[PDB]
Amino acid sequence: DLSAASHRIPLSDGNSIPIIGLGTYSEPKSTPKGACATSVKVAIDTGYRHIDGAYIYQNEHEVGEAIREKIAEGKVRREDIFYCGKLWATNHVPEMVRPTLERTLRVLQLDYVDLYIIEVPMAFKPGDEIYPRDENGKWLYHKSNLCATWEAMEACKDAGLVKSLGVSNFNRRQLELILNKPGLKHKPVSNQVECHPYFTQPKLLKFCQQHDIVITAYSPLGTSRNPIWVNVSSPPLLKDALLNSLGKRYNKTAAQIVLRFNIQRGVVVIPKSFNLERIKENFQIFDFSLTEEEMKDIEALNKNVRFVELLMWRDHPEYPFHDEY
Ligand SMILES: NC(=O)c1ccc[n+]([C@@H]2O[C@H](COP(=O)([O-])OP(=O)(O)OC[C@H]3O[C@@H](n4cnc5c(N)ncnc54)[C@H](OP(=O)(O)O)[C@@H]3O)[C@@H](O)[C@H]2O)c1
Ligand SMILES: C[C@]12CCC(=O)C=C1CC[C@@H]1[C@@H]2CC[C@]2(C)C(=O)CC[C@@H]12
Structure with a gap:
């Protein structure tokens, strides 16, 4: 079923997605230029055929550079590569959707992306600033309309600019708002959310499965633990005693165990790493399996x-984490 050479799982729209991808977020301020490009190329040489990125990560052009060079090398064909892009909060106004995607297509220098998803269910005031706030530090929000935004996304697919549509950070209510939409043409094929052994997402996973929505686990290794976004109060996932003990049974690291855990349950994992050794390590999860116990x-x-937790946006009408799921 799942092997290094063949590990694509089905999407409800007829397309497929590699069960493991390379995450590409890296702090802009402290990340050397070229580190992303180099990493993506190392991943493709290693065997990865899926790359996850976003215009707001500020390195989307480096992902494109790497993908085009490998195609030019004859290592892979465009159809062999799966790239996921994201529509940020400041770009939810319907008429802004296509222009935003086209901007990413320019950055990448590619004709289409394989997956395009609404990054967060919350709408922010339009503009160049990714994190808008006035002179008093008050966040500049905009009025959300998930159905109008989704229709704009569907138009992008019809025009051939993207193969499959999906969402990120959506809870159950937000998903059903789209699923029960009148005249729905393209249902969400996936939902990218935080998922790992400390936050297994039991109810959200079950719901998505019932609707043929595939969950992509972001921060599958528990994040880089940057105090700005991470609740450092919770201990380091990779230091967990059990996860480390289980690894010794197969001569695998804790990271390898947690990644195998999610892929074995049908959950796509997109671990990030700009380290040669680690990029390779994270891909070695097809030569063993975990027992039922x-x-x-x-x-x-x-x-x-x-x-x-994204607590800085807890008062946004569409904050996704107040509900149980
Ligand atoms: N849609 C969204 O809202 C959203 C939100 C957050 C993240 N994401 C996506 O999900 C991807 C993955 O999540 P993430 O970057 O937050 O965190 P993550 O994948 O959990 O990894 C965090 C840290 O783990 C390290 N690491 C990687 N492999 C390792 C290994 N084998 N052993 C020990 N440490 C290892 C990395 O350091 P080195 O690089 O030094 O190896 C990295 O900084 C992102 O890059 C992004 O593409 C999406
Ligand atoms: C990758 C990241 C930083 C390093 C870290 O330690 C933990 C996270 C998780 C939340 C990410 C954030 C990067 C910025 C993102 C994309 C947003 O604008 C909303 C979600 C947020």
Whole structure:
């Protein structure tokens, strides 16, 4: 079923997605130029065929550079690569959707993206500033309309600029608002959310499965733990005693165990790493499997505590984390 050479799982629209991808977020201020490009190329050489990025990460051009060079090398064909892009909060005005995607297509120098998703369910005031706030530090929000934005996304697919549509950071209510929309033409094929052994997403996963929506786990290794976004109160996932003990059973690292955990349950993982050794390590999860008991042991680690709470936007009408799921 899942092997290094063939590991694509089905999407409800007829397309498919590699069960493991390379995450590409890296702090802009302290990340050397070229580190992303180099990493993406190392990943493709390693065997990865899926790359996750976003215009707001500020390195989307580097992802494109790497993908085009490898195609030019004859390493892969455009159809062999799966790239996911994202529409940020400051770009939810319907008429802004296509222009925003076209901007990313320019940056990448590609004809289309394989997956385009609404980054967050919250709308922010339009503009160049990714994180808008007035002189008093008050966030500049905009009025959300998930159905009008979704229709704009559907138009992008019809025009051939993207293969599949999806969302990120959506809770159950926000998903059903789209699923029950009158005249729905293209239903969400995936929902990218935080998911790992400390936050297994049991109810949201079950719901998505019932609707043929595939969950992509972001921060599958528990994040880089940057105090600005991470609830450092929760201990380091990769230091967990059990996860490390289970690794010794197969001569695998904790990271490898947590990644295998999610892919074995049908959850796509997009671990980020700009380190040669680690990029390779994270991909070695097809030469072993976890027993039924081990899957249960890992599941029991769930604390129902998120590393990514986004508390700075807790008062936004569409803040996704107030509901149980
Ligand atoms: N849609 C959204 O709202 C959203 C939000 C957050 C993240 N994401 C996506 O999800 C991707 C993954 O999440 P993430 O970057 O937050 O965190 P992550 O994948 O959990 O990884 C965090 C840190 O783990 C380290 N690491 C990687 N492999 C390792 C290994 N084998 N052993 C020990 N440490 C290892 C990395 O350091 P090195 O690079 O030094 O190896 C990295 O800084 C992102 O890059 C992004 O593409 C999406
Ligand atoms: C990757 C990241 C930084 C390093 C870290 O330690 C934890 C996170 C998770 C939340 C990410 C953030 C980067 C900026 C993002 C994309 C947003 O604008 C909303 C979600 C947020």
